[PDB]
Amino acid sequence: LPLNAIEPCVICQTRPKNGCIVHGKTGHLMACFTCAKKLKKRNKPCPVCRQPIQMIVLTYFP
Amino acid sequence: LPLNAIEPCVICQTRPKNGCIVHGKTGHLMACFTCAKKLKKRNKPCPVCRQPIQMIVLTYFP
Ligand SMILES: [Cl-]
Ligand SMILES: [Cl-]
Ligand SMILES: [Cl-]
Ligand SMILES: [Zn+2]
Ligand SMILES: [Zn+2]
Ligand SMILES: [Zn+2]
Ligand SMILES: [Zn+2]
């Protein structure tokens, strides 16, 4: 089970990990929506795998 | 912060929550990839919001 999912965004260290960086059928979830959207807007790659960012998904945990 | 992110798949109660159900620019992450992919294969809606499932994203937590 992913025990690190409850830690804050690794970029701003303030908001929760709710900005999923999607590339193909995988995603890296380590940033908040705010931070992740700035990377997409700036045409930056995924911070952990450097693949292109297809979209940011605002991720809820029901 | 999403303290329920580290609980198991609400469907199979055995695998981790790594199957993000994506609809538009939002996602609900409460199931594993295995369970979520069965819903997408059967064209079932999102279990919590009933929107159509565009894709399942295999979600990693770096
Ligand atoms: Cl945010
Ligand atoms: Cl986007
Ligand atoms: Cl899919
Ligand atoms: Zn952030
Ligand atoms: Zn990535
Ligand atoms: Zn499951
Ligand atoms: Zn949903």
Residue numbers in the entry:
A (entry chain DDD), B (entry chain AAA): 430 to 491
Can you provide the manuscript's text about this entry?
The importance of the ubiquitin ligase murine double mutant 2 (MDM2) as a key negative regulator of the tumour suppressor protein p53 has been studied extensively. Second, it promotes the proteasomal degradation of p53 by recruiting Ub conjugating enzyme (E2) thioesterified with ubiquitin (E2~Ub; ~ indicates thioester bond) via its RING domain and mediates ubiquitin (Ub) transfer from E2 to p53,8 where Ub is preferentially conjugated to lysine residues located in the C-terminal lysine rich region of p53.9 Although the relative importance of these mechanisms is context dependent, in vivo mouse studies with ligase defective MDM2 resulted in the same lethality as MDM2 knockout experiments. The RING domain of MDM2 has been discussed as an alternative target to stabilize p53.19 The rationale for this approach lies in MDM2′s ability to still bind and inhibit p53 when MDM2-mediated ubiquitination is abolished, thereby preventing uncontrolled activation of p53.8 The RING domain gains its E3 ligase activity through dimerization with either itself or the RING domain of its catalytic inactive homologue MDMX to form a homodimer or heterodimer, respectively. The dimeric RING domain arrangement is essential for E2~Ub binding and activation as demonstrated by co-crystal structures with UbcH5B–Ub (en dash indicates covalent complex).
We identified G443 as a single residue being responsible for the pronounced aggregation of MDM2h, which could be eliminated by a single point mutation G443T. Since the G443T substitution produced a stable MDM2h dimer, we wanted to understand its impact on MDM2h’s structure and function. We purified MDM2hGT on a large scale with the aim to crystallize it in complex with UbcH5B–Ub. The structure of MDM2hGT and the orientation of UbcH5B–Ub are indistinguishable from the structure of wild-type MDM2h bound to UbcH5B–Ub, indicating that the point mutation did not affect the ability of the RING domain to recruit UbcH5B–Ub. G443T is located near the UbcH5B binding site and is in proximity to UbcH5B’s K4. However, in all MDM2hGT-UbcH5B–Ub complexes in the asymmetric units of both datasets, the G443T sidechain is not within hydrogen bond distance of UbcH5B’s K4 and in one instance UbcH5B’s K4 sidechain could not be modelled due to poor electron density. Based on these observations, the G443T substitution impacts neither the RING domain fold nor UbcH5B–Ub binding. Indeed, SPR binding analysis showed that the G443T substitution had minimal effect on UbcH5B–Ub binding. Consequently, the autoubiquitination activity of MDM2hGT is comparable to the wild-type MDM2h (Figure 5d and (e)).
